Design a protein around this ligand. Structure first.
Ligand code: NI
Length: 341
Protein backbone atom coordinates (compact mmCIF):
# COMPACT_ATOMS: atom_id res chain seq x y z
CA UNK A 1 0.00 0.00 0.00
CA UNK A 2 1.02 3.73 -0.44
CA UNK A 3 3.49 4.50 2.27
CA UNK A 4 2.93 7.32 4.74
CA UNK A 5 5.97 9.26 3.44
CA UNK A 6 4.08 9.88 0.07
CA UNK A 7 1.01 11.40 1.79
CA UNK A 8 0.65 15.07 2.75
CA UNK A 9 -1.38 15.30 6.06
CA UNK A 10 -4.48 17.48 6.14
CA UNK A 11 -4.81 17.34 2.41
CA UNK A 12 -6.10 15.06 -0.20
CA UNK A 13 -2.59 15.18 -1.76
CA UNK A 14 -0.03 12.59 -2.70
CA UNK A 15 3.51 12.97 -4.09
CA UNK A 16 5.13 10.59 -6.61
CA UNK A 17 2.48 7.86 -5.85
CA UNK A 18 1.30 6.58 -9.26
CA UNK A 19 1.82 2.81 -8.86
CA UNK A 20 -0.73 1.90 -6.11
CA UNK A 21 -3.87 2.15 -8.21
CA UNK A 22 -6.43 4.55 -6.80
CA UNK A 23 -5.24 5.91 -3.47
CA UNK A 24 -8.27 6.19 -1.16
CA UNK A 25 -9.04 9.85 -0.64
CA UNK A 26 -6.49 11.41 -3.02
CA UNK A 27 -7.92 14.36 -4.88
CA UNK A 28 -4.65 15.50 -6.61
CA UNK A 29 -1.44 13.57 -7.56
CA UNK A 30 1.75 15.65 -7.63
CA UNK A 31 4.79 14.54 -9.70
CA UNK A 32 8.17 16.12 -8.67
CA UNK A 33 10.08 15.07 -11.84
CA UNK A 34 10.21 12.75 -14.88
CA UNK A 35 12.21 9.81 -13.47
CA UNK A 36 10.73 6.25 -13.73
CA UNK A 37 10.83 5.33 -10.01
CA UNK A 38 8.75 8.47 -9.45
CA UNK A 39 6.27 8.42 -12.39
CA UNK A 40 5.93 4.60 -12.37
CA UNK A 41 2.34 3.75 -13.20
CA UNK A 42 1.37 6.79 -15.30
CA UNK A 43 -0.01 6.36 -18.87
CA UNK A 44 -2.64 7.54 -21.42
CA UNK A 45 -5.30 5.79 -19.23
CA UNK A 46 -4.88 7.95 -16.08
CA UNK A 47 -7.96 10.12 -15.30
CA UNK A 48 -6.95 12.11 -12.17
CA UNK A 49 -5.44 15.61 -11.92
CA UNK A 50 -1.58 15.60 -12.18
CA UNK A 51 0.16 18.70 -10.94
CA UNK A 52 3.77 19.25 -12.10
CA UNK A 53 6.07 21.74 -13.74
CA UNK A 54 5.72 22.88 -17.44
CA UNK A 55 8.69 20.67 -18.48
CA UNK A 56 7.43 17.57 -16.71
CA UNK A 57 4.08 18.25 -18.38
CA UNK A 58 5.70 18.32 -21.89
CA UNK A 59 7.21 14.82 -21.12
CA UNK A 60 3.88 13.40 -19.72
CA UNK A 61 2.09 14.47 -22.94
CA UNK A 62 4.75 13.49 -25.55
CA UNK A 63 6.55 10.49 -24.03
CA UNK A 64 3.84 8.79 -21.89
CA UNK A 65 0.80 10.10 -23.93
CA UNK A 66 -1.18 11.33 -20.89
CA UNK A 67 -4.20 13.34 -22.04
CA UNK A 68 -3.90 17.13 -21.91
CA UNK A 69 -7.06 17.57 -19.76
CA UNK A 70 -5.43 15.77 -16.76
CA UNK A 71 -2.02 17.55 -16.92
CA UNK A 72 -1.96 20.74 -14.76
CA UNK A 73 1.42 22.55 -15.19
CA UNK A 74 2.36 25.30 -12.69
CA UNK A 75 4.85 28.13 -12.96
CA UNK A 76 7.75 28.14 -10.51
CA UNK A 77 8.15 30.64 -7.73
CA UNK A 78 4.41 31.53 -7.82
CA UNK A 79 1.75 31.21 -5.13
CA UNK A 80 -0.98 28.98 -6.62
CA UNK A 81 -4.23 27.52 -5.13
CA UNK A 82 -4.86 23.74 -5.66
CA UNK A 83 -8.17 22.29 -4.35
CA UNK A 84 -8.23 25.13 -1.85
CA UNK A 85 -4.66 24.83 -0.54
CA UNK A 86 -1.83 27.35 -1.33
CA UNK A 87 1.25 25.69 -3.00
CA UNK A 88 4.54 26.87 -4.48
CA UNK A 89 6.90 24.91 -6.82
CA UNK A 90 10.71 25.64 -6.45
CA UNK A 91 13.63 24.51 -8.57
CA UNK A 92 15.05 21.35 -7.11
CA UNK A 93 18.55 21.52 -8.88
CA UNK A 94 18.07 17.81 -9.92
CA UNK A 95 17.15 17.01 -13.65
CA UNK A 96 15.25 19.30 -16.07
CA UNK A 97 11.73 20.16 -14.82
CA UNK A 98 12.44 18.83 -11.25
CA UNK A 99 10.77 20.65 -8.40
CA UNK A 100 10.37 20.96 -4.63
CA UNK A 101 6.79 21.62 -3.34
CA UNK A 102 5.83 24.02 -0.44
CA UNK A 103 2.40 23.22 1.05
CA UNK A 104 0.66 25.85 3.28
CA UNK A 105 -1.86 23.82 5.31
CA UNK A 106 -5.27 25.27 6.35
CA UNK A 107 -4.30 24.68 10.04
CA UNK A 108 -1.12 26.88 9.62
CA UNK A 109 1.52 24.16 9.22
CA UNK A 110 4.04 24.64 6.45
CA UNK A 111 5.54 21.55 4.71
CA UNK A 112 8.42 21.31 2.19
CA UNK A 113 8.75 18.12 0.05
CA UNK A 114 12.15 18.24 -1.68
CA UNK A 115 11.41 15.56 -4.28
CA UNK A 116 14.90 14.60 -5.57
CA UNK A 117 17.32 17.56 -4.99
CA UNK A 118 20.91 18.73 -4.92
CA UNK A 119 20.93 21.28 -2.10
CA UNK A 120 22.58 24.56 -2.86
CA UNK A 121 23.11 27.85 -0.92
CA UNK A 122 21.03 29.59 -3.68
CA UNK A 123 17.97 27.93 -2.17
CA UNK A 124 18.49 29.95 1.03
CA UNK A 125 17.32 33.08 -0.98
CA UNK A 126 14.21 31.69 -2.66
CA UNK A 127 10.69 31.99 -1.20
CA UNK A 128 11.83 29.48 1.45
CA UNK A 129 13.52 32.23 3.46
CA UNK A 130 10.17 34.08 3.94
CA UNK A 131 8.54 31.84 6.56
CA UNK A 132 9.09 28.92 8.88
CA UNK A 133 8.84 25.28 7.63
CA UNK A 134 7.60 22.78 10.22
CA UNK A 135 7.90 19.43 8.40
CA UNK A 136 10.54 18.37 5.74
CA UNK A 137 10.11 15.35 3.44
CA UNK A 138 13.85 14.90 2.59
CA UNK A 139 15.83 13.32 -0.28
CA UNK A 140 18.22 11.26 1.83
CA UNK A 141 19.98 9.34 -1.13
CA UNK A 142 23.52 10.19 0.13
CA UNK A 143 22.85 10.74 3.92
CA UNK A 144 26.21 9.35 5.22
CA UNK A 145 29.54 11.13 5.67
CA UNK A 146 31.51 8.92 3.25
CA UNK A 147 29.53 10.61 0.39
CA UNK A 148 31.67 13.56 -0.80
CA UNK A 149 31.88 14.63 -4.37
CA UNK A 150 33.15 17.53 -6.35
CA UNK A 151 31.09 20.39 -7.66
CA UNK A 152 29.33 20.00 -10.98
CA UNK A 153 31.47 22.84 -12.39
CA UNK A 154 34.75 20.96 -11.51
CA UNK A 155 33.46 17.79 -13.14
CA UNK A 156 32.44 19.52 -16.41
CA UNK A 157 35.87 21.30 -16.52
CA UNK A 158 37.58 17.88 -16.31
CA UNK A 159 35.44 16.33 -19.04
CA UNK A 160 35.78 19.31 -21.45
CA UNK A 161 39.68 19.34 -21.03
CA UNK A 162 39.96 15.50 -21.42
CA UNK A 163 37.84 15.36 -24.59
CA UNK A 164 39.42 18.40 -26.27
CA UNK A 165 42.98 17.09 -25.69
CA UNK A 166 42.05 13.61 -27.03
CA UNK A 167 40.36 14.78 -30.23
CA UNK A 168 43.07 17.36 -30.94
CA UNK A 169 45.78 14.67 -30.59
CA UNK A 170 43.68 12.35 -32.85
CA UNK A 171 41.02 13.89 -35.15
CA UNK A 172 39.71 10.33 -35.92
CA UNK A 173 38.73 9.73 -32.20
CA UNK A 174 34.96 9.46 -31.43
CA UNK A 175 33.51 10.63 -28.09
CA UNK A 176 30.63 8.58 -26.66
CA UNK A 177 28.45 9.49 -23.62
CA UNK A 178 26.05 7.16 -21.78
CA UNK A 179 22.52 8.03 -20.68
CA UNK A 180 19.43 6.18 -19.25
CA UNK A 181 17.11 8.99 -18.22
CA UNK A 182 16.92 12.81 -18.37
CA UNK A 183 19.49 14.69 -16.32
CA UNK A 184 23.18 15.38 -16.71
CA UNK A 185 22.68 16.97 -20.16
CA UNK A 186 25.52 19.44 -19.31
CA UNK A 187 28.07 16.55 -19.67
CA UNK A 188 27.44 15.86 -23.37
CA UNK A 189 26.44 19.44 -24.21
CA UNK A 190 29.69 21.02 -22.80
CA UNK A 191 31.88 18.40 -24.60
CA UNK A 192 29.98 18.86 -27.94
CA UNK A 193 30.40 22.65 -27.56
CA UNK A 194 34.22 22.64 -27.06
CA UNK A 195 34.53 20.26 -30.09
CA UNK A 196 32.25 22.37 -32.43
CA UNK A 197 29.99 19.35 -33.02
CA UNK A 198 26.26 18.72 -32.35
CA UNK A 199 25.48 15.66 -30.34
CA UNK A 200 24.01 12.76 -32.25
CA UNK A 201 21.46 10.35 -30.80
CA UNK A 202 18.55 8.06 -31.47
CA UNK A 203 15.17 9.44 -32.57
CA UNK A 204 13.63 8.45 -29.13
CA UNK A 205 16.25 10.42 -27.21
CA UNK A 206 16.10 13.45 -29.49
CA UNK A 207 12.31 13.60 -28.88
CA UNK A 208 12.95 13.46 -25.07
CA UNK A 209 15.40 16.36 -25.31
CA UNK A 210 13.09 18.46 -27.52
CA UNK A 211 10.58 18.58 -24.48
CA UNK A 212 13.00 20.31 -22.03
CA UNK A 213 12.86 24.06 -23.01
CA UNK A 214 16.64 24.13 -23.38
CA UNK A 215 17.58 27.47 -25.13
CA UNK A 216 18.89 27.12 -28.74
CA UNK A 217 18.53 23.33 -28.56
CA UNK A 218 18.08 23.03 -32.37
CA UNK A 219 21.65 24.30 -32.68
CA UNK A 220 23.05 21.60 -30.29
CA UNK A 221 21.53 18.22 -31.08
CA UNK A 222 20.79 16.05 -34.15
CA UNK A 223 19.66 12.63 -35.29
CA UNK A 224 22.30 12.52 -38.04
CA UNK A 225 25.05 10.34 -36.53
CA UNK A 226 27.25 10.86 -39.60
CA UNK A 227 27.66 14.63 -39.11
CA UNK A 228 28.41 14.29 -35.37
CA UNK A 229 31.52 13.31 -33.39
CA UNK A 230 29.80 13.21 -29.92
CA UNK A 231 27.44 10.22 -29.76
CA UNK A 232 24.91 9.38 -27.04
CA UNK A 233 24.14 5.79 -26.30
CA UNK A 234 22.18 3.78 -23.75
CA UNK A 235 24.30 3.46 -20.63
CA UNK A 236 24.03 -0.35 -21.00
CA UNK A 237 26.07 -0.16 -24.20
CA UNK A 238 28.98 1.73 -22.36
CA UNK A 239 31.39 -1.18 -22.02
CA UNK A 240 34.14 -2.64 -24.28
CA UNK A 241 31.87 -5.11 -26.19
CA UNK A 242 29.16 -2.52 -26.75
CA UNK A 243 31.73 0.11 -27.87
CA UNK A 244 33.70 -2.14 -30.26
CA UNK A 245 30.26 -3.02 -31.69
CA UNK A 246 29.38 0.62 -32.11
CA UNK A 247 32.74 1.47 -33.69
CA UNK A 248 32.18 -1.14 -36.40
CA UNK A 249 28.92 0.68 -37.26
CA UNK A 250 30.72 3.96 -38.02
CA UNK A 251 32.36 2.60 -41.22
CA UNK A 252 36.04 3.35 -40.53
CA UNK A 253 35.35 7.07 -40.02
CA UNK A 254 36.83 6.67 -36.49
CA UNK A 255 39.76 4.61 -35.10
CA UNK A 256 39.51 5.32 -31.31
CA UNK A 257 36.68 5.82 -28.71
CA UNK A 258 36.81 7.95 -25.60
CA UNK A 259 33.68 7.23 -23.50
CA UNK A 260 32.14 8.81 -20.34
CA UNK A 261 29.94 7.08 -17.75
CA UNK A 262 28.44 9.80 -15.50
CA UNK A 263 28.03 7.83 -12.31
CA UNK A 264 26.58 9.04 -8.99
CA UNK A 265 28.98 8.09 -6.20
CA UNK A 266 31.62 5.36 -6.52
CA UNK A 267 34.13 4.34 -3.69
CA UNK A 268 37.23 5.85 -5.47
CA UNK A 269 35.57 9.19 -4.26
CA UNK A 270 36.85 8.40 -0.73
CA UNK A 271 40.52 8.22 -1.96
CA UNK A 272 40.91 10.10 -5.26
CA UNK A 273 40.45 13.76 -6.47
CA UNK A 274 38.98 14.79 -9.88
CA UNK A 275 42.46 15.89 -11.08
CA UNK A 276 43.68 12.28 -10.51
CA UNK A 277 40.94 10.20 -12.32
CA UNK A 278 42.01 7.60 -14.93
CA UNK A 279 40.12 5.51 -17.44
CA UNK A 280 39.69 1.74 -17.99
CA UNK A 281 41.43 0.95 -21.32
CA UNK A 282 41.29 -2.00 -23.77
CA UNK A 283 43.05 -1.31 -27.00
CA UNK A 284 41.82 1.81 -28.78
CA UNK A 285 38.78 2.19 -26.28
CA UNK A 286 38.96 4.18 -22.98
CA UNK A 287 36.06 4.59 -20.48
CA UNK A 288 35.94 7.34 -17.83
CA UNK A 289 33.64 7.07 -14.78
CA UNK A 290 33.02 10.70 -13.72
CA UNK A 291 31.22 11.56 -10.46
CA UNK A 292 28.56 13.99 -11.76
CA UNK A 293 25.78 13.96 -9.10
CA UNK A 294 22.30 15.48 -9.23
CA UNK A 295 21.74 14.59 -5.52
CA UNK A 296 23.06 16.42 -2.39
CA UNK A 297 26.42 15.43 -0.92
CA UNK A 298 26.27 14.63 2.86
CA UNK A 299 27.72 18.09 3.63
CA UNK A 300 25.36 19.98 1.22
CA UNK A 301 22.38 18.19 2.78
CA UNK A 302 23.57 18.95 6.33
CA UNK A 303 23.98 22.67 5.56
CA UNK A 304 20.48 22.95 3.98
CA UNK A 305 18.83 21.24 6.89
CA UNK A 306 20.78 23.26 9.59
CA UNK A 307 19.71 26.47 7.72
CA UNK A 308 16.04 25.39 7.52
CA UNK A 309 15.69 24.20 11.11
CA UNK A 310 12.64 21.98 10.55
CA UNK A 311 10.66 20.64 13.58
CA UNK A 312 10.35 17.15 11.99
CA UNK A 313 12.24 15.34 9.12
CA UNK A 314 10.60 12.44 7.14
CA UNK A 315 13.07 10.64 4.87
CA UNK A 316 11.92 9.56 1.40
CA UNK A 317 15.01 7.51 0.34
CA UNK A 318 16.74 4.47 1.97
CA UNK A 319 13.69 3.92 4.18
CA UNK A 320 13.45 0.14 3.53
CA UNK A 321 15.82 -1.22 6.24
CA UNK A 322 15.90 -0.60 9.98
CA UNK A 323 19.69 -0.15 9.90
CA UNK A 324 19.39 2.69 7.37
CA UNK A 325 16.48 4.36 9.19
CA UNK A 326 18.34 4.29 12.55
CA UNK A 327 21.59 5.69 11.05
CA UNK A 328 19.69 8.61 9.36
CA UNK A 329 17.86 9.45 12.64
CA UNK A 330 21.25 9.64 14.44
CA UNK A 331 22.56 12.21 11.91
CA UNK A 332 19.37 14.26 12.14
CA UNK A 333 19.86 14.45 15.94
CA UNK A 334 23.58 15.35 15.66
CA UNK A 335 22.70 18.21 13.30
CA UNK A 336 19.94 19.47 15.53
CA UNK A 337 22.17 19.41 18.64
CA UNK A 338 25.15 21.09 16.93
CA UNK A 339 22.93 23.92 15.58
CA UNK A 340 20.61 24.29 18.60
CA UNK A 341 17.12 24.07 17.12
NI1 NI B 1 15.47 11.40 -9.63
Amino acid sequence: TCPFYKKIPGTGFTVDAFQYGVVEGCTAYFLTHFHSDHYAGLSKHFTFPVYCSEITGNLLKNKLHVQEQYIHPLPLDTECIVNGVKVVLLDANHCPGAVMILFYLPNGTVILHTGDFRADPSMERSLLADQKVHMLYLDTTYCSPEYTFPSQQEVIRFAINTAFEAVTLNPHALVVCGTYSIGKEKVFLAIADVLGSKVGMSQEKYKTLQCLNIPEINSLITTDMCSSLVHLLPMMQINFKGLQSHLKKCGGKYNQILAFRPTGWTHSNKFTRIADVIPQTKGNISIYGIPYSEHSSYLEMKRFVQWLKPQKIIPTVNVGTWKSRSTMEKYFREWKLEAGY
